[PDB]
Amino acid sequence: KELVLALYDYQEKGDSEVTMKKGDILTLLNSTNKDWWKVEVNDRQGFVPAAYVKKLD
């Protein structure tokens, strides 16, 4: 934890980004930036758009 829900699909478009599918449950690594959050998807980690993931309570 903490976990986030992928609200939308996101295809990585750079070396520090990562790909995710709508509905995936990702471990949130870092949400300090307003635009890009660091998440783990299984064996991959990297940044996705903050608008596209929802913090789970």
Curated annotation (Swiss-Prot):
<comment type="subunit">
    <text>Like erythrocyte spectrin, the spectrin-like proteins are capable of forming dimers which can further associate to tetramers. Interacts with ACP1.</text>
</comment>
<feature type="domain" description="SH3">
    <location>
        <begin position="1"/>
        <end position="57"/>
    </location>
</feature>
<comment type="function">
    <text>Morphologically, spectrin-like proteins appear to be related to spectrin, showing a flexible rod-like structure. They can bind actin but seem to differ in their calmodulin-binding activity. In nonerythroid tissues, spectrins, in association with some other proteins, may play an important role in membrane organization.</text>
</comment>
<protein>
    <recommendedName>
        <fullName>Spectrin alpha chain, non-erythrocytic 1</fullName>
    </recommendedName>
</protein>
<comment type="similarity">
    <text>Belongs to the spectrin family.</text>
</comment>
